[PDB]
Amino acid sequence: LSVDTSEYNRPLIHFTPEKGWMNDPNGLFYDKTAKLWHLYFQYNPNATAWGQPLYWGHATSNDLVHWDEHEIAIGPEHDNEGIFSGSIVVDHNNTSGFFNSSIDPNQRIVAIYTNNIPDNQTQDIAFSLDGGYTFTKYENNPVIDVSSNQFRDPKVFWHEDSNQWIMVVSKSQEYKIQIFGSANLKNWVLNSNFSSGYYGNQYECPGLIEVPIENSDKSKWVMFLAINPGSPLGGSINQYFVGDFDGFQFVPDDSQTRFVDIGKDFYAFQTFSEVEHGVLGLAWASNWQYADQVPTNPWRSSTSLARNYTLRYVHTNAETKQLTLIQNPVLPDSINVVDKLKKKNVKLTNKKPIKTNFKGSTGLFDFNITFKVLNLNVSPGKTHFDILINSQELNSSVDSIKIGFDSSQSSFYIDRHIPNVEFPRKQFFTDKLAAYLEPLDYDQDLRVFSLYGIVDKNIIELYFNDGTVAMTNTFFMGEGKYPHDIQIVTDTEEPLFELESVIIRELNK
Template identity: 35%
Template sequence: MKKFLIPLFAVLVILLVVGFKASKDKQQKKIKITTAYLLFPVEENADEVKTTINYPDKKLPDIFWIRLAQSKVDYWVKLEVGKYKGKNLELIFDGPSAAKFGIKRIKPSDHFKVNYPEPYRPDFHFSPEYGWMNDPNGLTYLEGEYHLFYQYNPFGTKWGNMSWGHAVSTDLTSWTYLPVALWPDTLGAIFSGSVVIDKNNTAGFGRNAMIAIYTSSGKVQSQCLAYSTDKGRTFTKFEKNPIIPNPGITDFRDPKVSWYQPENKWIMALATKQTVTFYSSLDLKNWNRESEFGEGIGSHAGVWECPDLFPLTYEGKTKWVLLVSINPGGPNGGSATQYFVGDFDGEKFQADPLPYPLWIDYGRDNYAGVTFSNISENDGRRIFLGWMNNWDYANETPTKIFRSCNTIPRELQLINNGNHCILSSYPVKEVDLLRERTVDFPAQIVENENTLNELLKDNDGSFELRMILQPEKGNVFGFTLQNLKGEKLDFVFDLFTQSINIQRNKSGLIGFNDRFPLGMNAPLLPKKSYEIRLLIDKCSAELFINHGEIVMTSLFYPNEVMNTLKFFSKEGTLKVENIKVGDVK
C-alpha cells in the first residue's frame, strides 16, 4: 500500500492546485443598482473575459465577451441598467486572473461621455459613439426620421458581441445615437438584416409597425423577427422565432425584405453560401421558398452576403438591381459589393447579359451596403449606405475608442456609361448643405506639374474638392493630395491601360496591416473630360467621377492634414477647370 501513497498524494495536490486556479479565474460580483449605467474598463489588447450578467427579471442571463482591463484602462464602455435601480445584478467573470484589475474598477455612473482625443473621428460621416461597427442594417424611413441600425459591439472596438446599434436622423447627415435595439439571445448573436414598415398590418402587430427581420447566428444561422410599435425605440422578439429555420446551410444569412406591390406580398433576398435565395410571405412570419440565383454568374471568389433587391427606372422601363457583397474576392482584394441588373417577376430574378462582375465601388473600403426602405414616392430616391472598411484589416485600423464609419449616403441610378448599363452612385443632395465656404482657384494648364499650396485656411481635414480634368495630350495624368510631412494620396488616370489608380502606400499610418498599403484600380473609359468630386473626411476619401459613373472609396490615416494639391501630366497637357474647394462640416 505504501508505494501508492506518494502518487495518490501528488494527484490530490495537483487537483487542489487546478481547482484553486479555476476558482481564481471565475469571479463573482453582486452590485446593487443605483445609477443609469455600469461602466466597464477596457484594455484594447487584453484577453477577452466571458462576462455573465444575471438580471432579476430574466430567466436566462446575458453573456458577453469583454476585454476587461488587466494592467491599464484604455477606455470605458457602458451597460445600461437604470431600469433595475434598487435591485441587485450578479456578474460572473470567467477569464484570466489578471482581469481582477478591471473587475475592481467597474463603477456605477449616471453619466457616460466619450471625450477621448480621436484625430480620425469623421465630421460628416456616421461613426458609432464608441465600440465596433460593421454592416449597416435595417435602413428605413418613418415619420420624418431615417433609421440606421448597424452591426455593433458595445463592449469593445473589435468584432464580437454582435448586436444592433441604432441611430436616427432627419437629414441623413447628422445622427442621434439611441440605445442598442437588439441584443444577442439564446438563438445566437444578432447578425445583419432589414427593417420594413408594415403599413397594412400584414403581420398583426399594428399598422405602421416597424418589423425587423434578422439573422440569429448561434450553433446555426436562422432568420428571426422582432417588432416595434414605438418607432424603433423598443423591440419585442417574436415568440415563435425562428421564422425560417436553417435548412442545413453554413452561410444562411442577411435577409433583405421588401414589399412587392404587383402581388401584394413580401419578398426576401437571403444570402445562401454563394447564391441568393428568394422567399415570399403574406404576413412576414410564414415564408415560402421561390427560387435561387447566382450559379455561374458574377464573382464567386468568396462568400455571398448582404443581398438587396430593388427596382430602378432605366430608359423609361423598370429594371431590377440585385446587390451582393462578397468576401473575399473584391476587385482590389478583400471585401466588396457586386451588382446585377435584370428583371424580377415576383419569383425569379433574371440577369441581363452584362460584363459581370460589376462593382458598385472600386475602392477597397465600401462593403455590405444596402438601401433604405419606405422612402416616400414624392422623394422617389433609392438611397444607399455602405460600411467604410475592408475585412482585410477592419479589426486593426488605428482609431481608439471607436472603429469604423459609414460611407456618405448615396443616391443610386441606372445610367449608360457609353458601353452598357451601369449602376451609378452619388452623394445625396443633403450633403451639399454641409458646405460652409468655398474657395475658387484659377484654371490650370499642366505640362509637367502644378501645385496649389494651401487649399483651405485652417483646414481641419474635412473638405470637398470639385474640378474638371481635360487631358489634351498624353495618356497619364492626375492629381495628388499631400501634406508637409510628405504623406500623400495619388490619383492616377491612365488612358493607355484605361484605368484609374489610387495609391495610399505613402499616406501616413500604414503599418498596422500589410494589405492596407496595396493600391486599387478601376476601369476608365477614354473621354474628353472627367468631372471630379472628392470628399475628404479626416481618414476617408470618396472619389466620384462623372456624377458617380466611377466610384472609389478609400481610407487613409495621415499624421497631419493634407492641404496641398498637385496636378501632374506625363508626355502631354492637362487642363483643369472649375477648381473649387469647400469646407464641409
C-alpha cells in the same frame, strides 16, 4: 480607454459609433411621419473588434449627415449569440397582425434579421411600437429554419406586382441568393435560387430593388451581393446584376460580373426602405482583411456616405454602351462651407500648381473637377496630373495621399500609402488602386472627364464621370495629422490637361 484618436481620425459626416465596434449597416429605413432616417448596425459595444454578445446598434438622422446615436435596439438572448444582419420594413396594412389602430401606418416597423446561435443561423422577426427604438421579438421565432449554420442576411421588401413580401437571403457557402415569399412576414415559401458573378468564398448581404433609368420612365431590377473573403481586390467587395423580377425569380439581362465600388473599403451595402423618389443606400466602409486592426480608438469603422442610385447608358469602350449602375453622394444644404477655392479653364503646367490656402482645417474637404486632355506629346513619365491631400506639418513631417489621372491609360488612380504608420495585417492594405473610364464627353476631338472626391479625416470617396464608377478607401495618417490642404499638380512643362472647372471646398458638419 485612455487613447482617443477622434481629433485627427474620426469622420465628421460619416456615421461612427461613439465607442466599440461596427460592421454591416442594418434595418435601413425612413420614418415618413417622424421624417427620420434610421441606421442600425452590427455592433459590439464591448471591444474594438467583432465579438458575441452581438447587437443591432441604432442611430437617426434628419439629413443623412448629422447622426444621433441611441441605445441598442436589439440584443441576443445569451452571451453565446448575436443578432446578425438584416433589414426593416413598414407593414402599413398590418399584414403581420402586430399593430393596432394605435400605431401610425408608416411607423409599423418590423425588423427581419439573422439570429446566430452555436451551430445555427435562422431568420427571425421583431416589431417596434415606439418608432424603431425598442423591439419585441416574435413569439414563434424562427420564421425560417433550414437546419443550417450558413444562412443569413435577409433583405425584405413589399413587392407590389405579386402582392406579397419578398426576402432575399444568402445561403452563404452554397453560393445561392434565395428568394422567399410571404403574405405574412411569418410564413415563408422558397420561390427560387440565384447563383452568378464572382463567387469568392461566400455569399453575404444580398439586396434586390427596382432602380430608375435616368431620363426615362423605365427601370430595372438590380440584385446586390456582398462576397467575403475572396474579392479579386482582396477581402470583401460588393457586386451587382441588372435584370428583371416577377416576384418569384430574378432574371439578369446578361451574365456579366460588375462591382458596386472598386475601392477596398465598401462592403455589406444595403438600401433604405420607404424612400420615395429613387434608391438610396450605404455600406460599411472597411474591409474584413484589416478592419479590426486600423489605428482608431475608442471605436472602429464608419459607414460610407448615403448614395443615390440610378442606371445610365455609358460607354465602357468607344463603340459600346452598357446600362450601368451610377451612384452619387447625398450631401444636403445642412453641410457648411467653411472656405473654398474656385478656378476656371486652367492650363495646368509644372509652374502653375493649384494650391489651397485656408485658415485652419476641420479635416473635411471635397473637390470637383472637370478636365480636358489636350493634344500634346509628353514623355511617358509625365502623362498625368495629381491631386495631393496633405496633412499639416507636425513634427517636421507632412503626410499625404494622392489621387491622379493618367491620360495614356485613361485611368484614375489612388495611392493611399503613408510611410511609418504600421498596424497588423497591413500586408493586405493595398495602397495603389486604379479605375479605367471612357471619356465623359468630347469637346470636338478633346476627351473630357469629371471627378468628385470627398475626404473626411480617414475616408476618401471618389466618383468618376458623374458617378459612373465609385471608389471608397480609408486611410490612416500618422498620429495627430489630418487633411489640411489640397494641391493639384503636374510635371508637364506645356499643358496636357485643361481644368475647365475646379471647385475645392473645406466643409463642416
